[PDB]
């Protein structure tokens, strides 16, 4: 059980770090009372989504690696995916919202106030939640306890699954659609916006309107640093979300069969951990970019 003990020991460490970070960002928004504005609104919404993901999705996974049976039961099996998929949707889509908000501020610094901004921005956050909630609804409807037949141990065990065996196209269609909606579509938009942000941030550094280039050396460096950090934000999100989706897609294509092997075991552990790491690289990276936000973070800690 040493390998089994390791799975909660690492899982719990990562969950703890992520909870600490996201909770501190939630604290900052409410406590200052002046930190409330259009940019901070889309960061709190993302941290809220990441809190839901870490609090709900991960412990169920640790239970799945530590328990031979489903503790929640049938109603619980219909409740859990509805929260997991909704949290995934909110997180992945608020990230795209942040990427477009930043692009608007940095690349076009004209009419940023845009009349009733706080209202429109609040509305957009609520609107993402409705789409996430609809996707989680079919997952909950088809999420039932189904029997699975291992070909190695030759044992028919019943486990909570997101669709019935009777259908052999519904599995494949659902998994492929989830991949495009929660990975390819959001990543493609984030890449288009951040690439433009970095391009302009560098163009601005060598086009600064100062006669003496020496007096502004520091500033130029900082701009050249911001571009690299934004490109790194596009890469992390890609990396973490590729294996989680790959393992899920693979298992959904070979649905009838249940593959128990060392390769699949370790790849599953790594994929889910990479996916959970995104919730913690989201706030901690902004923590690294700003010194004023660092001061605020430490004060709340």
């Amino acid at each position: 059980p040493g390998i089994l003990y390791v799975i909660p020991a690492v899982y719990g460490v990562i969950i703890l770090i992520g909870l600490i970070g996201n909770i501190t960002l939630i604290k900052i928004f409410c406590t200052v009372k002046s930190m409330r504005n259009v940019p901070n609104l889309f960061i709190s919404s993302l941290a809220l989504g990441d809190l839901l993901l870490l609090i709900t999705c991960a412990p169920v996974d640790a239970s799945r690696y530590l328990a031979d049976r489903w503790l929640f039961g049938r109603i619980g099996c219909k409740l859990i995916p509805f929260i997991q998929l909704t949290s995934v949707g909110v997180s992945v889509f608020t990230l795209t919202a942040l990427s477009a908000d930043r692009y608007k501020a940095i690349v076009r610094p004209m009419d940023i106030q845009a009349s009733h901004a706080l209202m429109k921005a609040c509305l957009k956050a609520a609107f993402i939640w409705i789409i996430s909630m609809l996707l989680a609804i079919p997952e909950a409807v088809f999420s039932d306890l189904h029997p699975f037949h291992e070909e190695s141990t030759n044992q028919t065990f019943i486990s909570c699954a997101p669709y019935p065996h009777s259908n052999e196209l519904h599995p494949k269609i659902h998994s492929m659609a989830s991949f495009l909606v929660f990975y390819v579509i959001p990543l493609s938009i984030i890449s288009v916006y951040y690439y433009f942000i970095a391009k302009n941030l560098i163009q601005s550094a060598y086009n600064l309107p100062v006669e003496g280039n020496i007096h502004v050396k520091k500033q130029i460096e900082s701009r050249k640093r911001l571009a690299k950090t934004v490109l790194v934000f596009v890469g992390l999100f890609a990396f973490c979300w590729l294996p989680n989706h790959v393992i899920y897609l693979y298992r959904s294509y070979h649905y009838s069969e249940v593959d128990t092997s060392m390769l699949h075991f370790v790849t599953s552990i790594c994929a889910r951990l990479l996916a959970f790491t995104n919730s913690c690289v989201n706030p901690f990276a902004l923590y690294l970019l700003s010194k004023s936000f660092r001061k605020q973070f430490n004060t709340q800690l």
Partner: peptide
Amino acid sequence: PRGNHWAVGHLM
């Protein structure tokens, strides 16, 4: 372990 809930499951 007769059954392994990890081998078949949801997206996350």
